[PDB]
């Protein structure tokens, strides 16, 4: 029958803001195009790339983008961009 | 916990990491190493991880002071069309022999 069964006490949840992989290797990237969003630092800035105060990775010079693997147990990723060359 | 020698290598490494992460325009580097007896200088070009030339007191010159080493290697770089160099402190402080070398490099037409 009817009964005041309530007491949820929690339904709160924050709006999810998209992040992660926004670009990939093999595409020409003009300067200023954001490549990877993250909360933290899981992709170290390599060469010819810049880091913004949100730790946001972006490019400075044109060229093809590539990822490299390194680290103490080979589990760290670097993003880099090379000039368009043959 | 260190040995006065690993510390020098460690601080040279922190400085090298700083120079490699900071650069957005390409300038050759002039590394300097001070030892117990004398000093040495090495002109390195980046983007290739190779070395143009070097100088020291081991080239049959007097030990330290010795500011002449701070000129000839400079003349080495200007003859290879390099005037935009960055001065590394190696694993030492910008003072004494290092400062003497820096002023020697400065006074013969180098820009840093």
């Amino acid at each position: 029958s009817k009964k005041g069964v309530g007491s949820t006490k929690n339904g709160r949840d924050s709006h999810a803001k998209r992040l992660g992989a926004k670009k990939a290797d093999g595409q020409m990237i003009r300067t200023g195009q954001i490549i990877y969003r993250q909360r933290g630092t899981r992709v170290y800035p390599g060469v010819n790339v810049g880091l913004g105060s949100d730790d946001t990775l972006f490019a400075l010079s044109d060229g093809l983008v590539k990822y490299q693997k390194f680290g103490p147990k080979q589990g760290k990723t670097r993003v880099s961009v090379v000039k368009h060359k043959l | 916990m260190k040995t006065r020698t690993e510390q020098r290598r460690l601080r040279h490494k922190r400085i090298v990491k700083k120079i490699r992460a900071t650069n957005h325009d390409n300038r050759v580097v002039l590394m300097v190493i001070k030892s117990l007896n004398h000093i040495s200088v090495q002109a390195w070009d980046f983007s290739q991880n190779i070395v143009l030339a070097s100088s020291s007191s081991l080239a049959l010159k007097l030990k330290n002071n010795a500011k002449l080493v701070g000129q000839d290697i400079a003349d080495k770089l200007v003859k290879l069309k390099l005037t935009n160099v960055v001065f590394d402190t190696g694993g030492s402080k910008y003072h004494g022999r290092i400062a003497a070398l820096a002023e020697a490099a400065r006074e013969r037409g180098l820009n840093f």
Partner: protein, 136 residues
């Protein structure tokens, strides 16, 4: 009965137990074990019943080993209430059972005694049990 004392969470989700078993696929300590040929959910009260039956039919001569333990806590919303209003309340602790893994094991007692003990303990479980010997 056999219950954990604290947990970082109070009401976790359920778990599927389809597919072949994981871990405890072979005997370890006892000489003769009881394997389960069906995955299901068993509470600690049935485990207690099986253990007391094993002990009573065993005597202070052999030894027995229990291979699993309830690590999960489901909920059961009280009776005659409407749907919603969050999750209910926990009232039992259950151990997931995957098919093809052993439940109880015994050793150090003649063959007829251990066989009858395992058969007596088997009917107390809601799974299709099967006897098994040590792999040697």
């Amino acid at each position: 009965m056999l219950q954990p004392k604290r947990t970082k969470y109070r009401k976790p989700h359920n778990v599927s137990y389809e597919g072949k078993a994981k871990g405890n696929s072979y005997v370890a300590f006892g000489e003769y074990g009881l394997v389960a040929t069906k995955g299901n959910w068993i509470d600690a009260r049935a485990i207690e019943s099986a253990r007391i039956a094993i002990s009573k039919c065993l005597g202070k001569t052999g030894k027995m080993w229990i291979r699993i333990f309830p690590h999960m806590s489901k909920t059961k919303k009280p009776l005659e209430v409407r749907m919603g209003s969050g999750k209910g309340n926990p009232e039992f602790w259950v151990a997931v059972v995957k098919q093809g893994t052993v439940m109880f094991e015994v050793a150090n007692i003649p063959e007829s005694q251990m066989i009858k003990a395992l058969t007596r303990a088997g009917h107390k479980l809601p799974v299709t049990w099967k006897i098994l010997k040590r792999e040697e």
